[PDB]
Amino acid sequence: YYSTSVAKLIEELSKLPGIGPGTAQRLAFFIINMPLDEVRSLSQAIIEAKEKLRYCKICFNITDKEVCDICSDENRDHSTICVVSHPMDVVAMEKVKEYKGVYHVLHGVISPIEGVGPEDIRIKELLERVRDGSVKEVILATNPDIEGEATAMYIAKLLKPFGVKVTRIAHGIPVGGDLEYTDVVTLSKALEGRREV
Amino acid sequence: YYSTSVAKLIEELSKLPGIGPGTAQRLAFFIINMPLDEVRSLSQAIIEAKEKLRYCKICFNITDKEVCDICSDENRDHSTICVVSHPMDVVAMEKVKEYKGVYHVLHGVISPIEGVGPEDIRIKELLERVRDGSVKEVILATNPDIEGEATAMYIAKLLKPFGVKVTRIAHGIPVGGDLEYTDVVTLSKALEGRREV
Ligand SMILES: [Zn+2]
Ligand SMILES: [Zn+2]
């Protein structure tokens, strides 16, 4: 079949997302052909990322320290909080280079097979950050999904009673998109949200 | 090479957009194999569409009559005009099923190799429709292009001095899009345009 070990690697690698049995092989071999120092590194890396991983006690983003890097920054507005459902969403948001607020990851909002060793949702703490802080606005940056919606709504409900300006990220036509082509839904929301001048 | 006629058809067909030399052949043969009545139809069709074509004297959309079907409808708000740069944009807009205004195609806004037998731009008439009508709003439904912009702007300028509410179609994240994935620009506009609650 396959050298019992090489067999093994293929299995591990295949368990990965988007990594199919074919591309699995190609990689097993590259790896195996790689230089033992290079190989070690790929290996330390994979394991140390798992144990070291931790979740900011302030915003619940992924990070390696007790409190995340954004949070403990100082050069950033801790009075605008950008709400988000999944930690990658921050890395998306964060390549914007023109946002200066902090964030809040609601976790178990996306709870597919969640609670993986104890992954639970964080709405309560979002409130207490607002209920007990001095927050100006709360930007909901969640999916135009029918799932991204209803979060945006719900949460706008829990926050409305406070003094905060709750706002949602804009839905419509992507920069460099063509309405000639766009989805009707899309372009249908694109209508609903037309803004003066 | 190719039966001189079959040769010919391939040439004509290839002149078409997105129709490449290979797919050209496949079609030539299907066609040629098609039933002479079916073939005639494809043929009448192609030519009659060209001559019959005409441009609504009211909104400058493509149509076969002297004035377009929307325009002469009655069941539609002729006081909301949806501005657009290219007649397909209307067919996009029009599958929305929740717009009840009329439109205006600015033509030579998209003037690539325009003036094809006399295709010229229609901004002036957009004004006179407003300057001499009773129009409530003017929805600019143009591309998040850097080209779609500047139209939206310019035209909002020409109309501002009137009483009209000028509004632009919304830019951001497509319905069923994922900001985890979206373009930075996109998602960067998606920020700029955040709307309360
Ligand atoms: Zn943090
Ligand atoms: Zn018309």
Author numbering:
A (entry chain A), B (entry chain A): 0 to 196
Relevant lines from the article:
To investigate the significant difference observed in TTERecO binding after mutation of the TTERecR Lys21 residue to Gly, we solved the 2.8 Å crystal structure of the TTERecRK21G mutant. The space group of TTERecRK21G was F222, with only one monomer in the asymmetric unit. Four crystallographic symmetric TTERecRK21G mutants formed a ring-shaped tetramer similar to the full-length TTERecR structure. The main difference between TTERecR and TTERecRK21G was the positional change of loop. The offset angle of TTERecRK21G reached 90°, suggesting that loop plays an important role in the binding of TTERecR to TTERecO. Moreover, we found that mutation of Lys21 to Gly in TTERecRK21G only lead to slight deviations in the polypeptide chains. However, this slight offset resulted in the helix-α (residues 143–163) moving 3-4 Å away from loop, breaking the interactions between the helix-α (residues 143–163) and loop. The distance between Tyr153 and Pro117 increased from 3.25 Å to 20.88 Å, and the distance between Glu146 and Ile112 increased from 3.45 Å to 13.01 Å; these shifts induced the loop to offset by 90°. In the crystal structure of TTERecRK21G, the loop (residues 117–122) flipped 90° away from RecO and lost their interaction with the link region (residues 78–88), the helix-α (residues 87–99) and the helix-α (residues 228–234), which are all in the hydrophobic pocket of RecO. Based on this analysis, we speculated that the Lys21 is required for the interaction between TTERecR and TTERecO, and the loop in the Toprim domain is the most crucial site for the interaction with TTERecO.
RecR is the most conserved protein in the RecFOR pathway; RecR binds to RecO, and RecO interacts with SSBs, then the complex facilitates RecA filament formation on ssDNA-binding protein (SSB)-coated ssDNA. RecR is a zinc metalloprotein, which consists of a helix-hairpin-helix (HhH) motif, zinc finger motif, Toprim domain and C-terminal hydrophobic region. At present, the HhH motif is thought to be required for binding DNA, the zinc finger motif plays a structural or DNA-binding role and the RecR Toprim domain is the binding site for both RecO and RecF. In this study, we investigated the structures and biological function of Thermoanaerobacter tengcongensis RecR (TTERecR) and its series mutants.
